[PDB]
């Protein structure tokens, strides 16, 4: 793996948060 796996999120915006 080595790689990301949830989302930080940076904005106001309707959106389903990915892990």
Known sequence: ???Q???QP???VQRN???
């Open 1 to 3: 793996s080595s790689g």
């Open 5 to 7: 796996i949830s989302i």
């Open 10 to 12: 940076t904005f106001s």
């Open 17 to 19: 948060l990915p892990f």
